[PDB]
Amino acid sequence: HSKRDASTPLRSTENGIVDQVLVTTNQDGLKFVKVRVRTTKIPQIGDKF
Protein backbone atom coordinates (compact mmCIF):
# COMPACT_ATOMS: atom_id res chain seq x y z
CA HIS A 1 0.00 0.00 0.00
CA SER A 2 2.39 2.68 -1.25
CA LYS A 3 -0.28 4.98 -2.68
CA ARG A 4 -3.09 7.09 -1.24
CA ASP A 5 -6.31 7.41 -3.24
CA ALA A 6 -7.17 10.87 -4.57
CA SER A 7 -9.81 9.83 -7.11
CA THR A 8 -12.83 12.00 -7.89
CA PRO A 9 -16.32 10.43 -7.68
CA LEU A 10 -19.39 11.38 -9.73
CA ARG A 11 -22.01 13.35 -7.76
CA SER A 12 -23.81 11.04 -5.33
CA THR A 13 -27.28 12.27 -6.29
CA GLU A 14 -26.63 13.03 -9.96
CA ASN A 15 -26.21 10.85 -13.05
CA GLY A 16 -25.79 11.09 -16.82
CA ILE A 17 -23.27 10.62 -19.62
CA VAL A 18 -19.66 11.79 -19.97
CA ASP A 19 -19.99 14.51 -22.60
CA GLN A 20 -16.36 15.46 -23.18
CA VAL A 21 -12.96 15.01 -21.51
CA LEU A 22 -10.18 17.60 -21.66
CA VAL A 23 -6.52 16.93 -20.83
CA THR A 24 -4.11 19.87 -20.68
CA THR A 25 -0.91 20.96 -18.92
CA ASN A 26 -1.04 23.95 -16.58
CA GLN A 27 0.98 27.18 -16.68
CA ASP A 28 3.38 25.64 -14.16
CA GLY A 29 3.66 22.48 -16.24
CA LEU A 30 1.04 20.52 -14.32
CA LYS A 31 -1.07 17.93 -16.14
CA PHE A 32 -4.68 18.73 -15.23
CA VAL A 33 -8.04 17.54 -16.55
CA LYS A 34 -11.60 18.86 -16.95
CA VAL A 35 -14.37 16.28 -17.42
CA ARG A 36 -17.78 17.44 -18.64
CA VAL A 37 -20.78 15.20 -17.98
CA ARG A 38 -24.10 15.75 -19.77
CA THR A 39 -27.57 14.99 -18.39
CA THR A 40 -30.92 15.70 -20.04
CA LYS A 41 -33.46 16.91 -17.50
CA ILE A 42 -37.17 16.47 -18.18
CA PRO A 43 -39.85 18.62 -16.46
CA GLN A 44 -41.11 16.63 -13.47
CA ILE A 45 -43.63 17.12 -10.66
CA GLY A 46 -41.96 19.74 -8.48
CA ASP A 47 -39.88 21.58 -11.07
CA LYS A 48 -40.09 25.36 -10.70
CA PHE A 49 -41.74 27.40 -13.45
Instruction: Give the residue with the Cβ less far from another protein, 2 or 26.
Output: 26
User: Counting contacts by CB under 8 A, is residue 30 touching another protein?
Assistant: no
Closest approach of Cβ 8 to another protein, in Å? 15
- Which residue from 1, 7, 24, 28 is in contact with another protein, where contact means CB under 8 A? 24
Query: How buried is 18 (Cβ within 10 angstroms: 0-12 exposed, 13-18 middle, 19+ buried)?
Result: exposed
Whether the Cβ atoms of residue 32 and residue 11 lie closer than 8 Å to each other: no
User: Counting contacts by CB under 8 A, is residue 21 touching another protein?
Assistant: yes
